[PDB]
């Protein structure tokens, strides 16, 4: 199952100044970038056009080019309309795309956040507010839902274009999507409010699923704390696993790493 996510972030500093920047993800791989400074959407993979013909891509891009300009003016007009309820600066984020399931099934979504809070989605044939959203948004929703042309275009974009485009991406991008990159590990230590803290560093692995445990022989140390997954710049992952121990208790300890890329040959590092 892969989630395709188009992420738009728009800053409005005052009546005149604004910028809109977009990134596109298929799972955890970036497929597109669209900087405010650029007239055109940039591919960040050789296969970013999917299975769309040049004419189909050109047509899709043109729709987005009109959208970006139109969006910018509409927000500025909605601010005037709700004035002085809402003032600049304003941040609007959109998260749109589809999740792909087996058997040619998918679900599409278009979620909108205002000043960092999810307030609005497109659902069915119209815009709606979601639970918790402020009441003033009822007027913008009324205005947005008057635009039958936008509703018809968005319906087609979510229902048809997104899944068709993404199915093509999954075919074209298969060998990047299914890449296996091996982790490399190393050990280190620091003090921690006392006691020592051993660190097992694991870096360069893809895809994300990984297993890392501190161990004495065959005894999995239950005090092992996995950190967050941190990205490397080359579309691999970094993770560290810590263990709090007593000074002089380090002997016997090892760090074991399981990953799909190692083909059963685990990494074992003895302190």
């Amino acid at each position, epitope marked *: 199952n892969y989630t395709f996510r188009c992420l738009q972030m728009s800053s409005f500093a005052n009546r005149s100044w604004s910028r809109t920047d977009s990134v596109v993800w298929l799972g955890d791989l970036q497929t597109h970038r669209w900087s405010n400074d650029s007239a055109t959407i940039s591919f960040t993979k050789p296969w970013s056009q999917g299975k769309l013909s040049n004419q189909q891509w050109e047509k899709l891009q043109h729709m987005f080019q009109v959208y970006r300009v139109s969006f910018t003016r*509409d927000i500025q007009e909605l601010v005037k309309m709700m004035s002085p309820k809402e003032d600049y600066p304003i941040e609007i984020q959109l998260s749109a795309g589809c999740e792909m399931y087996p058997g040619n099934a998918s679900e599409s979504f278009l979620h909108v956040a205002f000043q960092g809070k999810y307030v609005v989605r497109f659902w069915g044939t119209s815009w709606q507010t979601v639970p918790g959203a402020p009441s003033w948004l009822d007027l913008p929703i009324k205005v947005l839902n008057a635009d039958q042309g936008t509703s018809a275009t968005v319906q087609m974009l979510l229902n048809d274009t997104c899944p068709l485009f993404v199915r093509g991406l999954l075919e074209a991008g298969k060998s990047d999507l299914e890449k296996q990159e091996k982790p490399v590990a190393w050990l280190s230590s620091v003090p921690s409010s006392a006691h020592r803290q051993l660190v097992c560093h694991v870096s360069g692995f893809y895809p994300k699923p990984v297993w890392v445990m501190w161990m004495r022989g065959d005894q999995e140390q239950q005090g092992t704390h996995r950190g967050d997954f941190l990205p490397n710049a080359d579309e691999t992952w970094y993770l560290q696993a810590t263990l709090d121990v007593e000074a002089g208790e380090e002997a016997g300890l090892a760090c074991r790493v399981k990953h799909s890329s190692l083909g059963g040959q685990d990494i074992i590092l003895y302190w």
Partner: T-cell receptor
Amino acid sequence: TQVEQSPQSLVVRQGENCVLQCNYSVTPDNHLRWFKQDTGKGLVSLTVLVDQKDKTSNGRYSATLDKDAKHSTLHITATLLDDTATYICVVGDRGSALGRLHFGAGTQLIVIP
Amino acid sequence: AAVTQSPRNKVAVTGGKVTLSCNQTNNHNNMYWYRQDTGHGLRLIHYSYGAGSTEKGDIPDGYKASRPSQENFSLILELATPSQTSVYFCASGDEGYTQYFGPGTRLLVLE
């Protein structure tokens, strides 16, 4: 301007047909309206065209829109004296009140009785 | 959906104050002032999204707008000039794209 009408003016004899043109560069183009404006009077809507390729009719008036060419024509069949007026093309850039209207400068028709 | 304008015709002198009024009983949030001059399409001066709102259009200079109520939208020429000799049209609308136009006001500003 983003909306251009042709001809600027024309004179026809009663009973003759005529065709008025509207070309625009407005983007986007949600809909296009034709107005009739009699001398010293206000704007009377004749038709509104909304589809990518659209055709409408209203008695002796018929109109086409081609959004790909950004072009509309208004046809008047069997002109009458009362068709003497200015005919104005307007493009609305949104399907809502967030839209701006872009007005052409009009075509003056005179019908000789 | 009807819209009225007053006065329908006005002769004014340069430097004088002129107020053009538009009234609308449709309970429309949105009202719009335009001027029409030979050789040009209608051009937007000021508009309003409700009582207390006024917004600059494409050619606002020399005009002030006033929206005291849902019903009334005024165009005020504080210091009238001959360049403001024109036909002025008011319109109103709701969330839909249609603007419902008034019958027009003819203004002549003499020196």
